[PDB]
Amino acid sequence: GMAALLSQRQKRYQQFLAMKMTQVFDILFSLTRGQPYTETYLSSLIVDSLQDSNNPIGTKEASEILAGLQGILPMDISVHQVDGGLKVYRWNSLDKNRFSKLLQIHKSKQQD
């Protein structure tokens, strides 16, 4: 019924988001590390890199995914705002294998 419909769509979205977060990580990994990047640049880059007709991703989604990734990797990725303004991200070394493990753990805690 309705509860099943809500449940099923939510589960598909959980999978989608986790997939997208791993691609966002791949995108950050491809950039020159150790310099600031604005949220605006990174979110447009995520959308431009991953979007197609059949796999929509919007600016707001990309921004939240990026924020989630920093939240999971706070020891690797920093985020700063001046007076609640534009978010600016920085990182040095990133490790995908650690990230992949942390993602599954965080997904479990949230229940995906």
Numbering used by the authors: 493 to 604
Lines quoted from the article behind this entry:
In budding yeast, Cdt1 forms a stable complex with MCM before loading. We propose that Cdt1 stabilizes a conformation of the MCM ring in which the Mcm2–5 gate is held open to allow duplex DNA passage required for helicase loading. To understand Cdt1–MCM at an atomic level, we determined crystal structures of two non-overlapping fragments of S. cerevisiae Cdt1 spanning amino acid residues 1–438 and 495–604.
Although the C-terminal WHD of Cdt1 could be accommodated in our EM structure, interacting with the WHD of Mcm6, we have not modelled this region using our negative stain data, due to the limited resolution.
